[PDB]
Amino acid sequence: IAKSAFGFYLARRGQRKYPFLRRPHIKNTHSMNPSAPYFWSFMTAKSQMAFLPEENYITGDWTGKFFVSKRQVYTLQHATSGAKVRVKSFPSIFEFNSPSRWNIGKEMNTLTKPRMDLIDEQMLTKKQRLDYVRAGLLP
Amino acid sequence: QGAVATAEIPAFFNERPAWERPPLEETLYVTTNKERYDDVRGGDIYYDD
Amino acid sequence: VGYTPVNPDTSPMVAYSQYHWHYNLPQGMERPHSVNRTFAAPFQSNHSLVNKYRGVWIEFDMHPAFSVALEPQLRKLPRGRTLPKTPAEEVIADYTALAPLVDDEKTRDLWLAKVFQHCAFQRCGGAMELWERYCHQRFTAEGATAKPPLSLVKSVLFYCNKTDNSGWRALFDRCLKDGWNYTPLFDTAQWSFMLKSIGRMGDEDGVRAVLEEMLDVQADLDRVEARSVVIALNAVTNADVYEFVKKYLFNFGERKVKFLRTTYSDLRGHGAGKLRIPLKENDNMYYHVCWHSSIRSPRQFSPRQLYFDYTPSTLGSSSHNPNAKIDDIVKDKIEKWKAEGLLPEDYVHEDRVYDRS
Amino acid sequence: MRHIGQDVPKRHTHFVLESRLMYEKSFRDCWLHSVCRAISQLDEPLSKTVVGTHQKMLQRKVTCFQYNQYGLFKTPYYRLANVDRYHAVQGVAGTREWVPYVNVSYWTMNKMVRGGNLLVHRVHYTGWGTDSHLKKGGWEHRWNKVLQRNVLQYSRI
Amino acid sequence: AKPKKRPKVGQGFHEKAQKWREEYLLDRHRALADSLRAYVEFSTSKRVEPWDARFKPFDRIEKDGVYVLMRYMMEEKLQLCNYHHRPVKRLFCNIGLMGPQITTKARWKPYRFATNPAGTSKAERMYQRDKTVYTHGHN
RNA sequence: UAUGCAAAUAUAAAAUUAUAGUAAUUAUAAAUUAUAUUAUAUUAUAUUUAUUCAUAUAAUUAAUAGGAUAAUAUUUGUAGUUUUUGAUACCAUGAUAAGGAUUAUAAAUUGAAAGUGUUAAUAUCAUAAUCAAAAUUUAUUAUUUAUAUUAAAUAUGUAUGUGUAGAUAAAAUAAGAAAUUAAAAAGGUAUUGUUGCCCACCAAUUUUUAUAAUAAAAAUAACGUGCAGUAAUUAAUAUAUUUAUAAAAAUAUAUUUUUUUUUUUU
């Protein structure tokens, strides 16, 4: 059960059908979907000639960003500079402490797994743990 | 009969004919249209003296 | 129903109720309305007229031959809405060196008026010697009989107001009705400049005389600028002229007095830098202007502020007051009876109850 | 603030004003953003005057300017949430919880039609109404007819 | 009234989630390299004949019919195209001498049946492909 | 299961209860209340199709102020801190939905009023609100099946396994379907009306007769065990026997204040 302010304000109204590609809250759970032949044409800008998004650059006289935007595309300088790179994700943040050259040119949201396979055994309740065991997700 | 609409007629369309009116009704009588201070419970809230 | 109101124009239920016109009934105009014809308001604009000249005009009009002859000299003198930045001493020297040559009294007067206007625009106070050289001997001296042109007198007044000269009265008294009688032809800009100059100069009687003359000659108080009136009314300190100002302040309109108060407040507060010369502190006039604006403006209703300290009657609130005086009513009745004479006059009355405080 | 002497019954009604302001910002920025986007990613030469380096350098500079434009209204219209102006209830366009003509939610529409607050006419629930275009082709046909009435009717100069 | 802060995520979950994400990213790098290798090798390797030998155009004996044309005219380029369905269909279109017979009358084996290697002789080969390779059904 | 031991409702009566002293009347009646079509008869029902269903995020809601072609306002540039307190992260009265079983052919519609998150009086720490790129564990949802398969906002890598258990969904309206079917009776001791009266026991206070280690009777809104009676879940009433936590229960015999179903010499 996701806990957020909008959860009380809005209502799911069951498994309602939305217009194609027009769900209100976008949750790209398929960003980390791997596809070798379609590596450059999945969750990425369609044209190779397009410039990098505005989110990859600093515009004004900034004082500092806690985390960079997900659409910011990983570049060589991200690994070469050896600086601190963080991306907001559940639960709190994901930090790039393993700079690799195999992710150059791909978006950080594509690199980061949205739906983490790991399940917390601590906050899980008795009934919820029983449900997970019945589903097979937990022993 | 019950009313079916409401119009803002300028009140000279339906006047009291002169022969059943007090004499000239202007200088002899001074008339002021004020409002009752008691509970009307239905009636002329704004009545003239 | 609910906190949100219902708009009757959009709601069809109200529009089709018995208190409005149903759609089945014929749709037609009822009781045609003429509001703009029975009583049409004059055009009063919140914003000032953008295309206004906003200055004193001199009505420059001479013979075309003289104008074209003096064109090389007149290029330096100000034209219609065009002000050259030539030094004032240059035009003064040109006039004092070429005026005897040209033989036309009217042309000389117009040229001197233009010289005065230029030196007033430049705020050059040295040009009064020109007036003493040329005009003083024949236009105003020991009972001078000459009739000066309106252009020249207006230009001289503008110059003296700009330079805050003390010689304006000798000309204004001649310009009263018993003399030249040029007062009705003075523009509201001229009146505003006179009032501002006198207020800056701090003349107690000048402001009174100018205001009385304006009222007599039907000068447009509303179109007279608020700042000049504020400066003129700031300088009055004497009791008699202060009373005159108090009784005269009712001539202005309600909007005019409200904006006079606004301008006075802002100028003596934040707008102190707007004036080149700071305004002197006159708290009496400031308070009276604020009070007069409050009197003239419509009075709103603030019940809590009005009746914050209101206390009910002793008899009315006796039940709700634990320690209240009730024998005071009996004492008042006894006093009333003694005054009436029913009781013996000045009879000794002893306290009827104990004093609980 | 902080629910001290609140005047409106609902706090969320101010989000309607916020949405109107974001629409006004879109009105401001819709031309500049579109022009910058068009210039930035046009590979073909613009004209005889600008070609090659004179064009690519210009594209880079205009893209830099667009990025430096702080507060540009990037977001599209379809991703901006629609909130009723009467009861501050959110509805998403394209579903049945929002009407396009009145710009109010399904609940507000039902309340207003059940009371007397909006002059509407009743039609059969399982029909195509009374419009000839709706009877003919339906939603897409009436949409295309609106387009034809607006633009395609005119022989543009 | 009087709201209080309530923990949502586990006390040690954040760092565990971070290290799990890092390890998943490294595993994705390894799988991406493997998938690229497998896709390139599949594209280069020769595949089976994509034409059905049971329909009207491809029914004659190998010594007659369209097979003579294939063997004597376009045989050389089939090895270079590695018998993939798209290039063989395009070559059949461009060679002429067949006209619309490759689409109006000819038929081809399905997408997953035409991707089998040169010698298969078994139906269940398509399910023997590696599963950890994220080549999107390209062996 | 009558041989003995055993007067006994077929009524000469004076408001209830009680030993003929305990409390203040006690009983009873009528109307109404959801259980029972009958077999030609106000309609032939009986066929087709379908079922691995999932998503919500980064806090400030409490004023009016007019400009070109207009007979003149610097009102260009309009400047008075601070005593109140709820739709907010509970609660803070009302109001729309879904749910087909008997008014039919005919110049005609196969969707209901009994109520569904947001809406109009109860207050008393409440800053929870989208303007993108986001976090399945939650009843209420028709997905494309084997010749050709990723180009423009970024858009799904998963589950091939004899059309395959249980359980379950939909349609008799421009579609194609045809002889066994709706149509009886039958009840309140309840009136707070079954979520009801009422029953003893348990438990608690206390009164009267009594002085005998007595017994008996009576009053009482909340407990405990039950569900005995109230057409009331194997009917009830009377007497006798018997068992025992308690209402009671089982038998023997006799009754129905038990609601009822057609055979005039086959």
Ligand SMILES: O=c1ccn([C@@H]2O[C@H](COP(=O)(O)OP(=O)(O)OP(=O)(O)O)[C@@H](O)[C@H]2O)c(=O)[nH]1
């Ligand atoms: O009504 C207004 C408003 C503003 N000002 C501003 O006052 C400034 C000068 O300040 P003052 O207005 O005090 O000077 P002054 O008496 O010499 O002004 P004039 O009569 O010559 O105009 C000027 O630069 C003008 O912008 C006015 O003069 N009048």
Ligand SMILES: [Mg+2]
């Ligand atoms: Mg029972």
